[PDB]
Design a protein around this motif. Structure first.
Motif: not given
Lengths: 98, 102
Positions: B51, B56-58, A34, B47, A63, A67, A19, A44-45, B65, A38, A41-42
């Motif tokens: 997003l 976001s694309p995700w 980008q 989240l 995943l 990235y 960020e 954060r998940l 989930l 990605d 974001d991932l």
């Protein structure tokens, strides 16, 4: 510190790096931004799942790591923001294998 | 313009967390198991909301989930008391909204 705790911390240190690269780097490309986003974001998940002890944590973790390295391969340069972003991505992946 | 279903999903997610927190804080007759569910549901919904907010694309991955935890929360927390019904409903309503983005 359990490997899951260090992986979580590494993941958080990764989104912060991404960020940061996103808003600070003045020579970033649309693609590079980008890639940083990605991974951010991932991460954060995967992080949220690791905290909630979700059985999907490991799945999301990989995943994100995918990235995470793809982001380093594309966003690493010479400036601090660039080395930091790529570094944090590496450090994150390094905490996923265990 | 596929941002219409995503926006309605983002709003459903938001309503779902409100109901879950409300459930977590108000429903006195709540097992620790149900609390954990509503809690996981709320975090993931957060989240997922974020997003979708930053386009976001995700976002769909997060909604996938979240829908899971929302669906689990509904199956576990529904009850006779209004606080229980509303939570289940919000979760299910949210689950419904994720479909188009799945």
């Amino acid at each position: 510190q359990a490997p899951e705790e260090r992986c979580r911390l590494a993941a958080q240190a990764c989104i912060r790096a991404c960020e940061r690269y996103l808003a600070l780097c003045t020579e970033s490309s649309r693609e590079q931004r980008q890639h940083a986003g990605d991974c951010a974001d991932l991460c954060r998940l995967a992080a949220l799942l690791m905290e909630r002890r979700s059985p999907w944590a490991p799945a999301a973790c990989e995943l994100a790591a995918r990235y995470a390295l793809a982001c380093a391969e594309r966003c690493d340069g010479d400036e601090p923001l660039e080395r930091e972003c790529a570094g944090a991505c590496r450090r994150f992946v390094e905490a996923c294998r265990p």
